[PDB]
Structure 1
Amino acid sequence: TVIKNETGTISISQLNKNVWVHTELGSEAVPSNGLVLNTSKGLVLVDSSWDDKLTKELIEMVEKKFQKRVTDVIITHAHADRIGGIKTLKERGIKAHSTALTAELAKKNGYEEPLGDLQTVTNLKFGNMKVETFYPGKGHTEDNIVVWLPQYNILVGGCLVKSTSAKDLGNVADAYVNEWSTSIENVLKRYRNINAVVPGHGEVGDKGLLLHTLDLLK
């Protein structure tokens, strides 16, 4: 099931019972994927959106939809599509989780600072919903992390993972192209039984998306 806005810029699609994928188009419309986790104690998002207007609109949508508060957001890296709505998060009392490095880079890029609480391996539980954040090393950016939902074996790769039709790695000015391969290998070694994989943008797939990205990096 999918739910969008009248303009069509914001869409939310259900993966399973309590897991949805939020997608926003940043204008040439450029999409960005994130997750919406419906828990017994509120809504949790994996990544915000391009800017504050889109992020606020996204939050307004899911809150109206599930009739609950978005309590936390996990930021996967310090770029606009991930941390663009940080000001909106902070003004609404939404906890913006991130690694210390992501917080450092957010500041450098002119964004308000996220919590910087996430360690290399951080397990978070919101109600019955379990979430694991993992820093696999440098790739798309120096700070990129992945998110794992152990109850569903769902992997949110962020921009470290490209979609099936993607033949372009995207912006590599802040990337560590050579190390990117080792980082993907660390994700593969850590999670031996992956089901669905959500790329930074594009359609949800499986472990084959990680192999595809390694192919592009060759």
Structure 2
Amino acid sequence: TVIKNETGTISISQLNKNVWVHTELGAVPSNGLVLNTSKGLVLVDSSWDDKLTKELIEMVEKKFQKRVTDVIITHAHADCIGGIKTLKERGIKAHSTALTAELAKKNGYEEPLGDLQTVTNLKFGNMKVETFYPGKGHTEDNIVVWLPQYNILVGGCLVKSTSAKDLGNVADAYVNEWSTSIENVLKRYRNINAVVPGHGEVGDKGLLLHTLDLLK
């Protein structure tokens, strides 16, 4: 099941019952998650900017007939925190680590909550979510999201997709530490099913090994 906007720059597809993957084109595609809970919609990352972000929010609210209550910002880059202004004026809580919050202000973005610690467990209705800071990699502040009831890992931009041969923007990256950070994710979650990369299609733990390979 896949739903798109008239333009084709925004799509939302179902992973399973309450988990969907949203993708926006900026033409570079960017992934995020949409969690349908008994108490509102929770998103993992926003979109490139405020127009795409408002538009994404509008679609999911229309489809599920619920409000987006929270959003998890994985790092301080446009494809993740691009629509923080949109989120704040709609009363949407933008969760982020303290580091991500200061880096956002540093990049001229409105500041997220800065409430997430190294390991944080959030539960929205019946939907369990865990955020984990593995260390520096793609950016200094990048975190991953884990859904223990489905064993789905949102590696975000710390993980590259299967056909990706480029690590992307490393001007802000910590290439050398990146590998150790992926290892921490691997040691922390032993039984991973699906992993969502920041760009590209959903895969498995093989995506993390693939990324470590690119990093060698």
TM over 0.5, shorter chain: yes
Structure 1: gaps of 5 or more residues:
none
Distance across 2 between alignment mates of 1:40 and 1:201: 28
The corresponding residue for 2:97 is: 99
Deviation of 1:215 (Å): 0.1
SS state at 2:202 partner: coil
Among all aligned residue pairs of Structure 1 and Structure 2, give the percentage whose two residues are the same amino acid: 100
SS state at 1:15 partner: strand
The corresponding residue for 1:137 is: 135
Deviation of 1:67 (Å): 0.1
Deviation of 1:86 (Å): 0.0
Deviation of 1:154 (Å): 0.1
Distance across 2 between alignment mates of 1:135 and 1:78: 14
SS state at 1:187 partner: helix
Q: Taking structure 1 as the reference length, what is the TM-score of the superposition?
A: 0.99
SS state at 1:203 partner: coil
Distance across 2 between alignment mates of 1:9 and 1:49: 11
Deviation of 1:146 (Å): 0.0
Distance across 1 between alignment mates of 2:4 and 2:209: 31
Question: What do the CA deviations read for 1:189-208 (whole angstroms, capped 9, x no partner)?
Answer: 00000000000010100000
The corresponding residue for 1:194 is: 192
Distance across 1 between alignment mates of 2:106 and 2:117: 20
Distance across 2 between alignment mates of 1:56 and 1:7: 15
SS state at 2:179 partner: helix
The corresponding residue for 2:13 is: 13
Deviation of 1:16 (Å): 0.3
1:23 and 2:13 are equivalent in the alignment? no
Distance across 2 between alignment mates of 1:110 and 1:99: 17
**Deviation >6 Å, runs of 4+:** none
Q: CA RMSD in A?
A: 0.2
Distance across 1 between alignment mates of 2:196 and 2:39: 24
Deviation of 1:74 (Å): 0.1
Distance across 2 between alignment mates of 1:37 and 1:45: 6
Question: What do the CA deviations read for 1:108-133 (whole angstroms, capped 9, x no partner)?
Answer: 00000000000000000000000000
Distance across 1 between alignment mates of 2:210 and 2:201: 13
Question: What do the CA deviations read for 1:7-57 (whole angstroms, capped 9, x no partner)?
Answer: 00000000000000000000xx11000000000000000000000000000
Distance across 1 between alignment mates of 2:126 and 2:109: 32
Q: Taking structure 2 as the reference length, what is the TM-score of the superposition?
A: 1.00
Distance across 2 between alignment mates of 1:162 and 1:58: 23
SS state at 2:52 partner: helix
Distance across 1 between alignment mates of 2:97 and 2:88: 17
Q: How many residues align?
A: 216
